[PDB]
Amino acid sequence: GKLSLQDVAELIRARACQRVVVMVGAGISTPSGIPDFRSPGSGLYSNLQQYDLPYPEAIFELPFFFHNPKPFFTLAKELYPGNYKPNVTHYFLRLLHDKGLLLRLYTQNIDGLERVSGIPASKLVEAHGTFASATCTVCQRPFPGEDIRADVMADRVPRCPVCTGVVKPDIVFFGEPLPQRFLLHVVDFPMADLLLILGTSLEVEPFASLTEAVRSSVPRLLINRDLVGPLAWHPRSRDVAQLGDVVHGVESLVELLGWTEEMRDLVQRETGKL
Ligand SMILES: [Zn+2]
């Protein structure tokens, strides 16, 4: 006796699941046009070859930042809040929160679109960082993202007002440790009664183990093109796959919840405010 997408949809309507924990990846955002800087062809990829990086991933290396910050900041300009807007996927999660069901949303994305869709900070774990804030590389003072917005959009490298050091946005670089809020997972996953995995393979650790971190009786809804990861290898009876386009699978569950109108309604107000 498996479950189906409607099954879950009805567990949320009946509110037999009311402490939902969601995990999202790159897949929920490419609908909003977030360009993969890794993939050639995208505009951002083009601008990055202009420099002397040995590979695209070296923007996220501290060495090949303090050597030249400009490559990173080229990404920074492209992703900096406002330039893109959230899609139906983020908004389902916005809604899921407003309806009081959202325990925590753990994201691997840096587009901060979870923020913009209107989910409060307390609900978010931006495990790979955010452009929302920054920190002086030298004097360690933090800065709200607006202060470096001026220099960033104008291709200048923002130096600190007190000491003139580089003000690096709070993006997690390879090698630096994951943000402190990631450690909420000790309490969130044991209290989660529903796990929701959208648009990512959960292949990189330590997120891969988190999927097995809900109690056994908890259903895990996956919505992704493929079926891989700890959901493929070690599945559970309570699991539900929704393979294919994420946007579509999101809409199908918004339907089966009967929210499809309330969703179009949210999409209305929040598109105007942007
Ligand atoms: Zn400083």
Numbering used by the authors: 121 to 394
What does the paper say about this structure?
We can conclude, however, that the key elements for Sirt1 inhibition by AROS are present in the generic Sirtuin catalytic core that is shared by all isoforms, and that we can thus exploit other isoforms as model systems for structural and mechanistic studies on its interaction with AROS. We solved a crystal structure of Sirt3 in complex with a peptide AROS 62-71 at 3.27 Å resolution. The structure was refined to Rcryst/Rfree values of 20.2/26.1%. The electron density revealed the Arg-Lys-Arg motif of the peptide ligand to be bound to the substrate binding groove, with AROS Lys65 in the active site pocket for the substrate acetyl-lysine, packed between His248 and Phe180/294. Arg66 is stacked upon Phe294, and Arg64 interacts with the mainchain oxygen of Leu298. Beyond these three AROS residues, the ligand is not well defined by electron density and appears to be flexible, without major contact with the Sirtuin. Comparing the complex to other Sirtuin/peptide complexes (Sirt3/ACS2, Sirt5/IDH2, Sirt1/p53) confirms that both types of ligands share the more closed Sirtuin conformation generally observed for Sirtuin/substrate complexes and the high conservation of residues interacting with the visible core motif of the respective ligand. The comparison indicates only subtle differences in the local Sirtuin conformation (small rotations of Sirt3 His248 and Phe294), likely caused by the Lys acylation of substrate peptides. The only significant difference between the AROS motif and a substrate appears to be the side-chain position of AROS-Arg66, which appears to occupy the pocket normally accommodating the backbone of one or two additional defined residues and thereby supports AROS binding and its ability to compete with physiological substrates.
